[PDB]
Amino acid sequence: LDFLRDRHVRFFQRCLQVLPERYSSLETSRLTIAFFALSGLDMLDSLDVVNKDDIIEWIYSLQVLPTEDRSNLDRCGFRGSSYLGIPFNPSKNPGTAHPYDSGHIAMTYTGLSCLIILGDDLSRVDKEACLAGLRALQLEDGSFCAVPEGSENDMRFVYCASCICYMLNNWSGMDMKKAISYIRRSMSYDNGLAQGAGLESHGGSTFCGIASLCLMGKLEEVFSEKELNRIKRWCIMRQQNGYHGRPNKPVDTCYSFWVGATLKLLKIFQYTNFEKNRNYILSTQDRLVGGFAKWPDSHPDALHAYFGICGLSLMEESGICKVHPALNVSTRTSERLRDLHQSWKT
Amino acid sequence: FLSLDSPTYVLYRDRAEWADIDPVPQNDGPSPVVQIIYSEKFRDVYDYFRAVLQRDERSERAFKLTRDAIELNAANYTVWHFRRVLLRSLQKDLQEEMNYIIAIIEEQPKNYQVWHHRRVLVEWLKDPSQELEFIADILNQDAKNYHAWQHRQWVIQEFRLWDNELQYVDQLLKEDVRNNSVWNQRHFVISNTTGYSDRAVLEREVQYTLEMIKLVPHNESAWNYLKGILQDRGLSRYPNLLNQLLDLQPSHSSPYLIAFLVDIYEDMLENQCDNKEDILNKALELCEILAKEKDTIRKEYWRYIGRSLQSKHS
Numbered sequence A: 001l002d003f004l005r006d007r008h009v010r011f012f013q014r015c016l017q018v019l020p021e022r023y024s025s026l027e028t029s030r031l032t033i034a035f036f037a038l039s040g041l042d043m044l045d046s047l048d049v050v051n052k053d054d055i056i057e058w059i060y061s062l063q064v065l066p067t068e069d070r071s072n073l074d075r076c077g078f079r080g081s082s083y084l085g086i087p088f089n090p091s092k093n094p095g096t097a098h099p100y101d102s103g104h105i106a107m108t109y110t111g112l113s114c115l116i117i118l119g120d121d122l123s124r125v126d127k128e129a130c131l132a133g134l135r136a137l138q139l140e141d142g143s144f145c146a147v148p149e150g151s152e153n154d155m156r157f158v159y160c161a162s163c164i165c166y167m168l169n170n171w172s173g174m175d176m177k178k179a180i181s182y183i184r185r186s187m188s189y190d191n192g193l194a195q196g197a198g199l200e201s202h203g204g205s206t207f208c209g210i211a212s213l214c215l216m217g218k219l220e221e222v223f224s225e226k227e228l229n230r231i232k233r234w235c236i237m238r239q240q241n242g243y244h245g246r247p248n249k250p251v252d253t254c255y256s257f258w259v260g261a262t263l264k265l266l267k268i269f270q271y272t273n274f275e276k277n278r279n280y281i282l283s284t285q286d287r288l289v290g291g292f293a294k295w296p297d298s299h300p301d302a303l304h305a306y307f308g309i310c311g312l313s314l315m316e317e318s319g320i321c322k323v324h325p326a327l328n329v330s331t332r333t334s335e336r337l338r339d340l341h342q343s344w345k346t
Numbered sequence B: 001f002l003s004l005d006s007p008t009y010v011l012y013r014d015r016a017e018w019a020d021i022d023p024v025p026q027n028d029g030p031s032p033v034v035q036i037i038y039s040e041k042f043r044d045v046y047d048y049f050r051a052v053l054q055r056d057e058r059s060e061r062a063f064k065l066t067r068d069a070i071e072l073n074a075a076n077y078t079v080w081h082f083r084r085v086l087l088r089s090l091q092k093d094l095q096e097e098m099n100y101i102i103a104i105i106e107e108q109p110k111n112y113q114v115w116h117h118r119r120v121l122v123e124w125l126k127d128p129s130q131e132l133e134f135i136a137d138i139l140n141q142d143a144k145n146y147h148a149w150q151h152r153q154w155v156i157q158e159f160r161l162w163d164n165e166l167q168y169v170d171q172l173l174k175e176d177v178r179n180n181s182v183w184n185q186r187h188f189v190i191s192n193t194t195g196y197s198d199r200a201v202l203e204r205e206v207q208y209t210l211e212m213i214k215l216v217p218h219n220e221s222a223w224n225y226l227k228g229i230l231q232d233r234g235l236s237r238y239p240n241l242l243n244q245l246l247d248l249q250p251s252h253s254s255p256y257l258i259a260f261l262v263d264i265y266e267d268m269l270e271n272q273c274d275n276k277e278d279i280l281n282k283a284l285e286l287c288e289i290l291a292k293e294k295d296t297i298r299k300e301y302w303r304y305i306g307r308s309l310q311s312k313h314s
Ligand SMILES: CC(C)=CCC/C(C)=C/CC/C(C)=C/CC/C(C)=C/COP(=O)(O)OP(=O)(O)O
Pocket: A032, A035, A106, A110, A156, A157, A159, A160, A195, A202, A203, A204, A205, A208, A244, A245, A246, A249, A252, A258, A328, B144, B145, B146
């Protein structure tokens, strides 16, 4: 039907507040929940309803700073929350050694991203430490892990690494040649991009791969015109009404961004069917509590609410800022980041 | 040992064996964001977990504590890491841990940490004897679980267990020829064993796919596989294919077939073929058929493809 803007603003506000114990499994990734809500409000031009200063301090308390002896550089970045019990410290004093405290690539990414959205200038971010931590996460094949202690490695983290290097405007955080190699090797026989070589191509990983290359400014250089045409074909075939993540799977609101944004980066989103996409997204809108769900008559969540909104933004929904398809922030925020980068260059 | 829901369960703060430890509370500072409220029981387990972690205590009691922490939240990667550290320190029976993780994954097949834990165990034991069967059970509850297929490909490649996979694939394609994950597995097996350069294999595969297409003509997966194994060899280099496809148009038509034909005609144009201007029209004719009636949702895309073909071959 119509877009319930105010309802979604309240939904995101609640996300930043207090959650029932049934959400305990989100503890270690509260920072990305914050990202969804903050970036979501930003996308709806409502950041005024939150105390940017309080949140900025909270975010900074999540930064893993190097210790006096700087012997933990390979573990710096941001935590998803304070579940380790380390005393509150908004990046003031130096790092307090802890056997198992380290950053998480997806948190370092959403953390920096949140700081920029809130207006912070990143002066309190130990840029060199984060980049040091980032490098430590890259594997031989070019992909990345989430934490230095070891974890699964795939395209998702390659995108995270790319976003971090882009925001800190310094690519010393990764071996770009090896990352690009990983992205190329993930292209499937059906022409989409998978989580890794040999795996089933997926809308999510295709976005991560393509967006990473755009952030590096090497899309054209890495894939031939013939190749890009094959990828475009794979991506545009994902639309049924809304978009699904892979052939023969049901559509899900979030793909309106994952795949839609990829199409935007490949400059052919304009050739998709807008009405059917918009209608599907809106059908997953929760008119009572706000936010969006993956499917209609399904429970809403911060992730699908954010991506449903970014999906709508791709088609310029009345009342929603234009999203920067590769950086996953509002163009406004991407512009502010450009200014920020300039000021540093002095 | 003492279950979290046992009538006789006792908070850690009330257990004698834990009297020497000072629990460590979590603190979000003055104004917490996205704060989750925790029950007494939950906070109690994690207050002691923080204590044990902070001191890197490699004790048997800490090992038992992780079982509870995991029951409360299996998505906490730090807990799993610490548990692995303890598994090594206390030299615990890994065959037993395999049973543990096997149960956990069955209950939470979409959790990244549990699949990672199992993979580390299999690497440690260098024993993949249980893997293919375990994965087949998970794939039986969800034939498209990405984690399961990923683990399966890792096991097969790492311990070279290719012998029966192509047969497993044939079995699943019979259960659901539309499962895109199985078609991907098929190409995974073949390209990692025989390869497709053997004309006898290529023929077997192209023939097999056409058979599947005839059974369910509207299946993107089958068509993608067919185009996938031929696109790099050059679609125009297979004259009998073009004709066999044109013979399907009558009955077994579908947007996938039409698209394939367009891709064949384009390959021809790309290879300075005979009747360039005539082939181009056969292509444009199909693009418009797709846009106006066969794949209308992609109307603007097909028209765009058409305009591209003209401005490239005229
Ligand atoms: C913005 C934030 C917080 C992070 C960005 C970085 C990440 C982690 C991106 C992930 C993108 C993505 C959606 C990758 C796909 C991974 C995958 C193979 C998911 C499979 O999940 P299923 O639920 O089985 O998917 P479908 O059923 O929709 O195919």
